[PDB]
Amino acid sequence: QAPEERCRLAAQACIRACERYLALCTESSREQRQHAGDCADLCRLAALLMERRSPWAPAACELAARYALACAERCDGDEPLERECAGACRRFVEACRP
């Protein structure tokens, strides 16, 4: 699996984690939900660009990673949905550096 393929997969696993946290988490704050959504949206963009081999892929990838960690810093807690959302955000960023 090429680093771009694992980064794409990590990004998709991220939006799934974020959209899940958004609709399932019963203790989320308006701000926290907003952070999850920003990461989910940006990750959809970076993902679509990675698939279409766009020269903007890397650019969008970093913008997504920025909010990906900002989302973890704000939405990580103790419940599974919370650790999962923050985890997936981490896993995504970890696949951006390479």
Added chain:
Amino acid sequence: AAQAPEERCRLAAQACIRACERYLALCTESSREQRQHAGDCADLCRLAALLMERRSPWAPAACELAARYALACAERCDGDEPLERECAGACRRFVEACRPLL
């Protein structure tokens, strides 16, 4: 209430993908290069549409990239055949709609 220009942009995006898919599926005289363009244009337009639909704050960012691919698709796919003209037109029309949201 700045959702008026965004809604008209969302509709332009939607029309643009319809024309692009139509182009991709119907225009027989189409190079693989033009097909790739109309295709990228259509996908980005999809994301852009979805982002505007859920009133995402990152919708303009998506419209920025989509406008790029739409503008490129127009510059590459316009032609004498109606399927070619309509695609270019839809893309350009869509590009025009993104302005206020840029």
